[PDB]
Design an enzyme around this catalytic site. Structure first.
Site, short mmCIF file in Angstrom:
data_model
loop_
_atom_site.label_atom_id
_atom_site.label_comp_id
_atom_site.label_asym_id
_atom_site.label_seq_id
_atom_site.Cartn_x
_atom_site.Cartn_y
_atom_site.Cartn_z
CG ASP B 121 -1.61 1.17 1.57
OD1 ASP B 121 -1.93 1.86 0.88
OD2 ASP B 121 -1.72 1.41 2.98
CG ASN B 152 5.59 -6.97 15.37
OD1 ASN B 152 4.58 -6.48 16.13
ND2 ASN B 152 5.47 -8.32 15.32
CG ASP B 154 2.86 -5.13 19.85
OD1 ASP B 154 3.76 -5.54 18.90
OD2 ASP B 154 1.67 -5.37 19.83
CD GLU B 156 0.41 -9.08 19.09
OE1 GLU B 156 -0.63 -9.18 19.62
OE2 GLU B 156 0.74 -7.93 18.59
CG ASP B 343 14.67 10.63 36.53
OD1 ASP B 343 14.49 11.47 35.93
OD2 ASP B 343 14.81 10.52 37.93
CG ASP B 381 -1.78 -2.74 19.71
OD1 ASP B 381 -1.11 -3.37 19.09
OD2 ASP B 381 -2.84 -2.54 19.30
CD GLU B 404 10.41 16.57 29.52
OE1 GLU B 404 9.11 16.61 29.06
OE2 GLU B 404 10.93 15.77 30.24
CG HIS B 463 17.35 15.84 34.42
ND1 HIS B 463 16.89 14.61 35.21
CD2 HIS B 463 18.64 15.05 34.19
CE1 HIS B 463 17.49 13.64 35.31
NE2 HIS B 463 18.69 13.97 34.69
CG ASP B 465 12.58 17.08 34.22
OD1 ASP B 465 13.86 17.50 34.84
OD2 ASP B 465 11.69 16.05 34.69
CB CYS B 639 6.79 11.53 44.21
SG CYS B 639 6.29 11.14 45.64
CA LIG Z 1 -3.39 1.62 -0.76
CA LIG Z 2 10.92 13.21 30.12
CA LIG Z 3 3.09 -7.54 17.62
CA LIG Z 4 -0.14 -5.57 18.35
#
Ligand SMILES: [Ca+2]
Ligand SMILES: [Ca+2]
Ligand SMILES: [Ca+2]
Ligand SMILES: [Ca+2]
Ligand SMILES: [Ca+2]
Ligand SMILES: [Ca+2]
Ligand SMILES: [Ca+2]
Ligand SMILES: [Ca+2]
Lengths: 659, 659
Positions: B121, B152, B154, B156, B343, B381, B404, B463, B465, B639
């Site tokens: 595509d 990829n 992540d 599953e 951090d 995800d 940042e 930093h 921040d 914190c």
């Molecule tokens: Ca397409």
């Molecule tokens: Ca940051």
């Molecule tokens: Ca995956």
């Molecule tokens: Ca996924």
């Protein structure tokens, strides 16, 4: 550039103001507690505006005018000319409480204005203009700007043998003409205020790409102080008052390559001293960019300057015929008393607006046939560059018989004004030979010749120069691609056989070939040899298609020259008779390897066929016999020639290469 | 595409014709000796033109028409539809000598036409279009094309703990939604002619950037065959007749980085078998390009989704006040029972036209405080990526408090629709700390956030921040930069002293600070502390100028918040009271660290001052006390919070980054 300079509570702040910037000044934080309003005075050469919530109003040198103190009411301070000092340049702020008109406190800003500009020839005319606003970037094309730097890869004197760029010392003045000028221009009072200094610097990364020298004119003669480069990242500049210029000369040490775009940066900063153990603050920084000029090859269509030839001193016919061919032209002939000039050397060039010179690329050593580089061509305005593999083995495909370049072409609308580099390779899935990555990467990185890989690995030697070449069409701006063709050779031999010439003998006058008694009949009746050459024609045709695609060529642009090969034990081709396509091209005059083909009415039918193809175009053909001194032809060429040509008139920096 | 297919002397040549190309055919080399003229016949689905010196004429299926044999008279052969076979597709050439009308020989071309297209595509709508002519390149912008691939990264299912892209096997179907579809579409007869095969392949270099799977539907269930990737450079495809489609799924294994542009290539070739020991010839090749999606950060202006918080279980005030703040919003609160979430983690995202998910960047391990990565956020995800130095030591500047990103800005006409990444550093000549090269290189390589270095090394922790943040202006599309200001703090304290409040005490309610008895008077009378903070204000102002320049900001875009620091033994700043600038921004609602400033009429004068600055803009301020559980403030924050935000609506591929 807006710079923050705030007043200090009950204090007089001193600051250097660099022209081309201006200051925004907080008077609110410095106001004493209880203060309500403020007034201000300023000297003649300082412009002061009172700014309330974005709206500005200019204020007189001394008004008694008072404004409400407020965080959103600030000053904007501008100067247009450097301090003479002389020069009281100041802004003074008075603070008042609610009741009473006498000031309760004061804060002040004492200013020294200076000009600082690091200048290069960004507009590419050879002169260093004042403060080109585009000097900090580099863009391609006729309207593009930014300064250009040559790799100073030639050698001014033979005393110190290495290329000039391999030393951190300048041993000769003429060297300066190879470098690019960079001028630090300053204007100001007699001295900088306490706590400031001016420093030139470069990044660690760029420190092996460049070197920078200042030419001092002390008592005993001019001398060149190396102020930035290998193991020098910064240089403290001695400040001179009034209007002053410091001239520097920059040399490139490295061509564009894998991991190096060719772009380098040089900076100057005005630094302010804070205290001991605290780094100096870069108050102002000015930057120039250089692009290092790429290494560029020359196609056969460009005017010849010198013909370099190597052979044995007894190859008389070769020398006589080359000398005579060159005498038809304005070229010089240079001879060395065996294919190294062709295989080990590619003559390129580099160019910048202020100058250019030719540069030799030296083929990598294999540790077998070549244990040593050829540096003997290194000299004044003749440069040298080489690439050697780290872990990769060198093969025949690293020879520069395998490195060529097309004439300028247009392909699908895209112009390649310098032509396209051509190198031979093997198919992706074949496991075959390929030119070393280090050399391929180098050629790709030059960018302006956008290299194309052809298929050469079907040949025993494996070089693109075995099967293809280019010639101009005389009297025009056009050119032809010449391709070796086995089908053309068979068609011709079949015609001659039909004509009653089957017993015509190949290799007449090579006594070492006589006992083989090779005839047209003998060749045409060899069935396996036919099959070998049909396959070789498929290999040639595969290349023909790549060349047409990548060079934007049609069938009208191509002439086929008869050729014949014999397959070796590796299923690779070696020439059966000399490959006529690999020829010396001096404009309209062509030195063509003498084929030693079958004689028909006492003329070589291959010579006559080739003349019939080329001569109607106004090309003059001279057949050059490099083999009869050896009494035989085994598929190997023992002589070599390499033509050094004038560079393209089109400037490489006027191109716009793909992202 | 013109392809060379020449007739063979007295023979019938078989060739596969790939639609979208056409052939030029030499009939001259195949003519018998003595032959003068030729004629030709061709079948219905073959278009044949006779071409003499560039001029073409179409010829009937069978004419008796004869042409003069000549090297410059050739055939051009075209087919518009795949062979059914069925399908006699052929061109036959007859040869005639001078005298007599019966053919003396014949040469022929038997053709099998097939369609082969590798499709992706490219037009970036999520569906794979047929043969996008732009599929072989990748261009930026709204009108740009070429296919996009997600890393990829992540996971599953938790069963196999590593990111999905670290395995050469697919253990779950949902994984397929993360990948990009690639379809090999073919149309042709029942079988390919003898001697051909179709092969998919990738370069060695790209083999660690991608993996490619085919989903087989055999008897016992769907399964995913890994056909290209690490240690698989090619795959022989099984040919299916008629109209057939093979669906493949491509995964990215690597983000753009130093030395990797993000672009990868996949090829399909039709190969012809020659003989044993001879490589197969790539008759036709089709290529698709993927660009791997960059890792992208989210500025404070983007809508919040989840607030992640880490603290000790007994910090009750902190938890209660954060919970309440979040309840003013639609965000979810997530708590872990010490600054690591802030951090060690930066929440980014990746996106392609077919999908996107958030991705965590994990700060490098130092071998001291962090011996292990935080992978526990890795899940469906929710992706993970990290960079670790090779030889370089990690410092405090590698913490993501030092990483940042700005809101979208326009600078000198150039738009940065995704904002600009901001990281703190030290001056070039300082010898100070800097974020590791490996991380800096990674951020630069993502390209779409064009990172800017600020000066953070004047701070002990170091930093960005600590000193700056961004907030939206409610009810508008605009934003403000907030800067820490020591001058603002001194002005305020001086006013309070003048007002009779000098004995007002800092740190009320922190019992561990009581014996210090710190008052406005005590602070204002400390001379060395004044000098330290004047210097720190110069450091802040240096940053203010870089931010204005690189973000295209004016004074109207900036609000200064009071802050105060104490210098350490390294001449670096640590907070004297909590830095209010480092705040939780949930749209119009701001969680601001509680400063514990001097009490005047029983309200903190710092809280009241900050409300007076922000509240007129429609910003709602909630002060969050993370320190009273510890009874004291030493300059350290115990914190942390990190807000995961919705991605920009602007698609990254619609940008046009600098060359
Ligand atoms: Ca397409
Ligand atoms: Ca940051
Ligand atoms: Ca995956
Ligand atoms: Ca996924
Ligand atoms: Ca100039
Ligand atoms: Ca020199
Ligand atoms: Ca020179
Ligand atoms: Ca060459």
């Amino acid at each position: 550039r807006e710079r923050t300079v705030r007043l200090q509570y009950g204090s007089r702040v001193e600051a250097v103001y660099v022209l081309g910037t201006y200051l925004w000044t907080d008077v609110y934080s410095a106001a004493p507690a209880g203060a309500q309003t403020f007034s201000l005075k300023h000297s003649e050469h300082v412009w002061v505006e009172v700014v309330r919530d974005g709206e500005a109003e200019e204020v007189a040198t001394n008004g008694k005018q008072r404004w409400l103190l407020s965080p959103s009411t600030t000053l904007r301070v501008t100067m247009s000319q450097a301090s003479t000092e002389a020069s009281s340049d100041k802004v003074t702020v008075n603070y008042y409480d609610e009741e009473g008109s006498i000031p309760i406190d004061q804060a002040g800003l004492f200013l020294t204005a200076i000009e600082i500009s690091l200048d290069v020839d960004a507009d590419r005319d050879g002169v260093v203009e004042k403060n080109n606003p585009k000097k900090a970037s580099w863009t391609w094309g006729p309207e593009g700007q930014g300064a250009i730097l040559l790799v100073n890869c030639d050698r001014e004197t033979p005393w110190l043998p290495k290329e000039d760029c391999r030393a951190e010392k300048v041993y000769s003045k003429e060297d300066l003409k190879d470098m690019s000028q960079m001028i630090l221009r300053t204007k100001g009072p007699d001295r900088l205020p306490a706590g400031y200094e001016i420093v030139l610097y470069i990044s660690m990364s760029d420190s092996d790409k460049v070197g920078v020298f200042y030419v001092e004119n002390p008592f005993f003669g001019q001398r060149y102080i190396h102020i930035l480069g290998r193991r020098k990242l910064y240089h403290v500049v001695k400040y001179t008052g009034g209007s002053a210029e410091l001239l520097f000369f920059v040399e490139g040490l490295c061509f564009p390559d894998e991991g190096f775009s060719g772009l380098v940066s040089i900076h100057v900063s005005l630094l302010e001293y804070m205290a001991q153990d605290i780094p100096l603050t870069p108050i102002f920084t000015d930057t120039v960019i250089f692009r290092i000029a790429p290494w560029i090859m020359t196609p056969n269509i460009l005017p010849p300057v010198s013909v370099f030839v190597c052979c044995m001193k007894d190859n008389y016919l070769f020398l006589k015929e080359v000398k005579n061919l060159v005498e038809k032209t304005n070229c010089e002939l240079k001879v060395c008393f065996d294919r190294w000039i062709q295989d080990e050397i590619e003559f390129g060039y580099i160019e910048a607006p202020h100058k250019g010179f030719p540069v030799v690329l030296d083929s990598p050593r294999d540790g077998n046939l070549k244990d040593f580089p050829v540096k003997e061509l290194l000299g004044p305005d003749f440069g040298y560059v080489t690439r050697e593999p780290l872990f990769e083995s060198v093969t025949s495909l690293d020879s520069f018989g395998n490195l060529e370049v097309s004439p300028p072409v247009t392909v699908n609308g895209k112009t390649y004004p310098l032509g396209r580099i051509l190198i031979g390779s093997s198919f992706p899935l074949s496991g075959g030979r390929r030119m070393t990555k280090v050399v391929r990467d180098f050629l790709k990185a030059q960018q302006v010749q956008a290299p194309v890989e052809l298929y050469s690995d079907w040949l025993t030697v494996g070089h693109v120069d075995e099967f293809m070449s280019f010639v101009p069409i005389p009297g025009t701006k056009k050119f032809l691609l010449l391709m070796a063709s086995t089908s053309a050779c068979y068609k011709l031999f079949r015609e001659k056989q039909k004509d009653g010439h089957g017993e015509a003998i190949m290799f007449k006058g090579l006594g070492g070939m006589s006992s083989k008694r090779i005839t047209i009949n003998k060749i045409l009746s060899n069935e396996s040899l036919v099959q070998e050459n049909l396959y070789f024609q498929r290999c040639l045709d595969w290349n023909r298609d790549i060349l047409k695609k990548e060079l934007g060529l049609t069938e009208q642009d191509i002439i086929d020259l008869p050729a014949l090969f014999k397959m070796d034990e590796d299923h690779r081709a070696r020439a059966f008779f000399p490959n006529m396509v690999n020829m010396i091209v001096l404009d309209k005059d062509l030195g063509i390897p003498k084929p030693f083909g079958p004689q028909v009415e006492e003329e070589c039918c291959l010579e006559m066929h080739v003349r019939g193809l080329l001569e109607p175009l106004g090309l003059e053909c001279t057949f050059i016999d490099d083999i009869s001194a050896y009494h035989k032809f085994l598929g190997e060429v023992h002589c070599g020639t390499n033509v050094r040509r004038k560079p393209f008139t089109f400037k490489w920096w006027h191109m716009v290469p793909s992202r």
